[PDB]
Design a protein around this ligand. Structure first.
Ligand SMILES: Nc1nc2c(ncn2[C@@H]2O[C@H](COP(=O)(O)OP(=O)(O)O)[C@H](O)[C@H]2O)c(=O)[nH]1
Ligand SMILES: [Mg+2]
Ligand SMILES: [Zn+2]
Length: 278
């Protein structure tokens, strides 16, 4: 016999159980109704307290769902923070692949360039010019340094009121940034393991090895194309209705690249991504 229903969010999925944070902040380890087809960290739930192990009664519809190449690992992500760094490698192709992933999942991306402390004036100007590629197509870019904490404040402001994950290649400083931001004292990131944490100034983050390894699954060409937001306005304006936007005569996208309206690396990476699929 249980009590009154209440809202909650899944902090972590214990395989057979789940730790649900109630709308009042208290965490309760709960069982899961057999009728629940799937429950993952980030799910918004209707639960009831036991009269101390409560029970999950239902799961609200997910605004988004993160999956592994097609099983859900996390739910209700609002923003994926794409983290890069000068070292070990600043890859525009990696960033572009992630952005395609964001557009496909329909979650807003946040491009973070970490380790700016490793650059001098000339280094800074170069990196900023690179990031302008992204600023110019509407994405917000943040220059930061975990070690110096520079730019960390605007990052917190961009994290508040949202549920994020930190995606990026190894060594860019994900664990470093998260530790600096979370200020954990009695927990440690795993440096079904996905767990959500609360940032001091608002907003949450779901983390674990798999989440950070957020990869791009098999996508159809059209999905890749939609994955480049600056392409949208040119679609339907190519000479051929079925223009593949490669060497096709009169391609509006390619010409835009040749005029400077679209960045060359974006077009180039668009094709590289297209190729690595099928
Ligand atoms: N110079 C510099 N080094 C950084 C910065 N942040 C992280 N590092 C170094 O980058 C390496 C990888 O950090 P890590 O958090 O493990 O990257 P991760 O694999 O994405 O979690 C070293 O462990 C960190 O000391 C930074 O802001 N500036
Ligand atoms: Mg603070
Ligand atoms: Zn075209």
């Amino acid at each position: 016999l249980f009590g009154e229903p209440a809202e909650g969010i899944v902090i972590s999925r214990f395989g057979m159980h789940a730790d649900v944070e109630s709308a009042d902040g208290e965490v309760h380890r709960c069982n899961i109704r057999r009728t629940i087809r799937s429950l993952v960290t980030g799910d918004r739930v209707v639960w009831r307290p036991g009269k101390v192990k409560g029970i999950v009664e239902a799961v609200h519809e997910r605004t988004s769902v993160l999956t592994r190449p097609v099983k859900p690992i996390a739910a209700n992500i609002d923003q994926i923070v794409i983290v890069s760094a000068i070292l070990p490698e600043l890859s525009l192709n990696i960033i572009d692949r992630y952005l395609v992933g964001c557009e496909t999942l329909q979650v807003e991306p946040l491009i973070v360039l970490n380790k700016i402390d490793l650059l001098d004036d000339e280094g800074m100007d170069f990196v900023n010019e690179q990031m302008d590629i992204y600023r110019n197509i509407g994405y917000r870019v943040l220059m930061v340094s975990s070690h110096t904490q520079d730019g960390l404040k605007p990052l917190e402001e961009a994290l508040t009121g949202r549920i994020s994950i930190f995606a990026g290649q190894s060594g860019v400083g994900k664990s470093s940034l998260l530790n600096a931001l979370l200020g954990l004292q009695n927990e440690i990131l795993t440096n079904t393991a996905a767990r959500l944490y609360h940032f001091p100034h608002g907003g949450d983050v779901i983390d674990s090895p798999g989440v950070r390894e957020f990869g791009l699954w098999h996508l159809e060409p059209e999905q890749i194309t939609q994955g480049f937001v600056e392409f949208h306005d040119y679609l339907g304006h190519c000479k051929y209705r079925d223009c593949k936007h490669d060497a096709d005569p009169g391609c509006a996208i390619r010409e835009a690249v040749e005029n400077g309206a679209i960045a060359e690396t974006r077009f180039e990476n668009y094709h590289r991504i297209l190729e690595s699929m099928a």
